[PDB]
Design a protein around this ligand. Structure first.
Ligand code: MG
Ligand code: MG
Ligand code: MG
Ligand code: MG
Ligand code: MG
Ligand code: MG
Ligand code: MG
Ligand code: MG
Lengths: 287, 110, 95, 140, 49
RNA sequence: UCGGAGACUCCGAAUGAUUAUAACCUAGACUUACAAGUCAAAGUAAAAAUAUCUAUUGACCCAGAUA
RNA sequence: AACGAGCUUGGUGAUAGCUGGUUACCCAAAAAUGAAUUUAAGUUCAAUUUUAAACUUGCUAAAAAAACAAUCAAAAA
């Protein structure tokens, strides 16, 4: 270009000609001149000038401000609280629009992370992704999304457009493998079973209205219809829809990945899957 | 980053619209980000200096400044204060005009 | 304050703060009123009402606590059902 | 299709059908959305409005339609179509839910007889005094 | 010619293919170099960095 | 240490009596290094609105108590 | 060869709110009042000061009228 044309005329670029970007660096002030020498910015003789003033929060000897306020349990149990990285429907639709999520295939935490739709940190107590009601109106997509937590209104958007929404619990060990599958296969260890939710979460994931994976299949129809009446839409017939098998697809409660059973081993180098023939191990894994 | 899939009807429900075809004939071209979005960002410094910056500008940046100055002057009632970073190829505008500029750039087809 | 710890070489959080104050992601700090559990039999009803409340911190106090706590205590926490969900952001503030 | 001990088939043997969950209930109970006309207007947030003609509201029982009209005649438009709107959220779904529910309440309150009105509030008490004062005033 | 897809608006740069085999074999072919590699904006701070 | 009076000289206090018993919640303010201490509409709730003067202080930690 | 408790090495670069010192030029702006503190040879906060940024009224003056030469302050300039 025109700017590129100027470079042609100018002398050859070399190691001598190198220059830092304007104002990128600062002058480092040293103590050798009158303004910055002598007392060297430390004032007169005293404790702060000897370099030995007290610690932070020390207010001269009176009871400090931070120690004189009652202890309260704002942050108690913080390290064991459950975190769900929320997902809104604007982000979901936006991701589907740009081809970073495949709506035709079933959706799960692995395919959200693969398309960089969501960022998950298992080490920071993340237990999955919670769907959020923001963006329901703009949502006009039919997709089978699995998310650990769901909401009433978020369910309506998925169902109204003719989609399947399910909620499943992944324990801390299961979640790490789900977000990051490949390395687990590199470790060489067999795939583990997925533990059931602890007592606190048992009511939620067994509840029909929450679309829990362990919930009774028979009660789903009624729960969907009641929600359909509430939000003023007519239930679509998924069975008639051509992709009924895909939408209806649901992984086993003890499965981390749809198509892989617990106890198998994946050999990427040889492009093979190894399954144990031992009866004892099969008993344990089948459980 | 997958190339966005072709859609029958634009804009998509989210709001995304691909670059217009044929390309604009203006001297300056504003390229899209690797995520296929218009490179217009709200920025802030010191906690109260609100600015909006166009980043992937190409060609004669000066023409873009003149066009933006005319576009934003009637709304504010004054010529906006702007900086042109020729080396970085960016245009900086005081205040937040992300929504207005995004649509304005969309019409031109950049 | 431990500015550089021997084993790791990092700054150390003061746990006297973690057990008294709550930080909202915007930068505000919450605290209780000293004495809200003390000698309630001689305090007036209006006096007791004030004590039960949660109070904010000043710019100086907020600046101090930010020096005595590490970045881990300044992150975003996505707790489901959090009763402080709405208070982590500032809205309609021009300043 | 790997099936664990906790597979939904074993847990709920009766409902082993693959399409049992994904089938649509028979129903036949209910607000006919097709009969109603729903228009969403953004007043920078949504506002829902439902306008269904009472005369053409065959789904509503005819005797109750008479009672609902007069009781809430103010909400009835000049054309005779009940007009009800709500604006309390940014999501048209939740705003629409309010519109539909008010119809159900109106039908339920009309169908049911509130035998006990019990006492009145200060506002009604003042109105009653005003009416009584007027009646005595019109001696002629 | 470029194996990858050049942006439509950009025009590929070109170079004179040469052969070291002969003293006078200065030019034997033509090449098309991807603009986003061989025509990026001139910035000497990155070279400095 | 606190407060009353005088313009430093005097008086009191770590409050008692009277109390047919005095809720919750919440705009705006006083005072003030911080901490503490003051007044209060609206809304709501008991009942058929303010306890009565004179004035009255003690943080955090940590131990006690109860359903 | 200076014992109110030997000397040598090590801990040890003991610690010192105390005394002393702290190395080129140039331009510019620039103050010992209130509170608490085993506090008054110290430190922390307020107030002041300063570098940057945001946007809009600020200083002197300020009639009448209040509360009584001040506390307050409206058009103006
Ligand atoms: Mg240095
Ligand atoms: Mg002391
Ligand atoms: Mg995260
Ligand atoms: Mg205070
Ligand atoms: Mg009131
Ligand atoms: Mg002074
Ligand atoms: Mg002392
Ligand atoms: Mg001292």
């Amino acid at each position: 270009g025109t700017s590129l044309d100027l470079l042609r005329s100018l002398p050859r670029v070399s190691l001598a000609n190198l220059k830092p970007s304007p104002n990128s660096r600062k002058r480092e002030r040293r103590p050798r001149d009158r303004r910055r020498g002598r007392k060297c910015g430390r004032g007169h003789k005293g404790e702060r000038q000897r370099g030995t003033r007290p610690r932070l929060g020390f207010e001269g000897g009176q009871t400090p401000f931070y120690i004189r306020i009652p202890k309260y349990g704002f942050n108690e149990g913080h390290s064991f609280r459950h975190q769900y990285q929320p997902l809104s429907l604007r982000r979901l639709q936006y991701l589907i629009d740009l081809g970073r999520v495949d709506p035709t295939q079933p959706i799960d935490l692995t395919q959200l992370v693969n398309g960089r739709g969501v960022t998950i940190q298992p080490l920071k107590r993340d237990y999955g992704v919670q769907l959020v009601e923001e963006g329901a109106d703009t949502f006009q997509a039919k997709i089978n999304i699995e998310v650990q937590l769901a909401s009433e209104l978020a369910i309506a958007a998925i169902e109204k457009n003719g989609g399947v929404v399910t909620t499943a619990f992944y324990d801390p060990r299961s979640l790490e493998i789900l977000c990051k599958p490949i390395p687990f296969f590199l470790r060489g260890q067999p795939i583990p079973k997925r533990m059931l939710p602890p007592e606190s979460l048992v009511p939620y994931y067994t509840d029909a209205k929450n679309r829990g994976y362990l919930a009774d299949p028979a009660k789903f129809p009624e729960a969907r219809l009641e929600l359909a009446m509430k939000f003023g839409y007519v239930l679509p017939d998924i069975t008639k829809d051509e992709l009924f098998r895909m939408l209806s697809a649901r992984k086993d409660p003890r499965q981390i990945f749809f198509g892989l059973a617990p106890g198998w081993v994946v050999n990427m180098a040889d492009k093979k899957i190894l399954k144990p023939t031992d009866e004892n191990l099969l008993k344990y894994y089948s459980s | 980053i997958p190339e966005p899939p072709k859609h029958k009807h634009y804009p998509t429900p989210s709001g995304w619209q691909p670059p217009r075809d044929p390309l604009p004939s203006l001297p300056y071209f504003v390229r899209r980000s690797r995520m296929h979005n218009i490179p217009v960002y709200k920025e802030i410094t010191h906690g109260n200096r609100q600015m909006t910056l166009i980043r992937k500008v190409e060609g004669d940046i000066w023409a873009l400044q003149k066009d933006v100055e005319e576009f934003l002057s009637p709304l504010l009632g004054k010529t906006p204060i702007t900086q042109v970073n020729e080396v970085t190829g960016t245009l900086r505008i005081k205040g937040y005009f992300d929504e207005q500029l995004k649509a304005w750039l969309l019409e031109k087809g950049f | 304050l431990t500015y550089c710890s021997t084993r790791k070489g990092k700054r150390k959080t003061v746990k006297s703060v973690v057990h008294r104050f709550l930080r909202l992601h915007s930068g505000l700090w919450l605290r209780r009123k000293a004495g809200y559990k003390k000698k309630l039999w001689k305090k007036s009803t209006a006096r007791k009402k004030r004590l039960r409340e949660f109070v904010f911190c000043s710019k100086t106090q907020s600046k101090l606590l930010d020096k005595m706590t590490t970045s881990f205590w300044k992150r975003r926490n996505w707790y489901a059902g959090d009763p402080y969900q709405m208070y982590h952001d500032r809205t309609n503030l021009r300043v | 299709t790997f099936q664990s001990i906790y597979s939904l088939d074993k847990l709920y043997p009766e409902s082993k059908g693959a399409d049992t969950a994904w089938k649509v209930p028979e129903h036949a109970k209910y607000i006919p959305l097709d009969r109603l006309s729903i228009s969403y207007c953004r007043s920078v947030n949504s506002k829902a409005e439902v306008r269904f003609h009472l005369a053409s509201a065959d789904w509503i029982e005819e005797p109750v339609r008479q009672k609902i009209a007069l009781t809430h005649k103010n909400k009835i438009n000049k054309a005779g179509e009940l007009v009800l709107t709500s604006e309390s959220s940014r999501y048209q779904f939740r705003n629409l839910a309010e519109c539909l529910q008010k119809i159900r309440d109106m039908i339920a309150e009309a169908s049911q007889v509130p035998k006990e009105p019990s006492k009145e509030d200060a506002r009604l008490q003042r109105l009653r005094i005003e009416k009584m004062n007027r009646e005595r005033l019109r001696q002629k | 010619k470029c194996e990858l897809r050049i942006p439509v608006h950009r025009r590929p740069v070109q170079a004179w293919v040469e052969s070291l085999r002969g003293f006078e074999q200065e030019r034997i072919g033509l090449a098309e170099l991807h603009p986003d590699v061989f025509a990026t904006a001139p910035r000497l701070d990155i070279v400095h960095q």
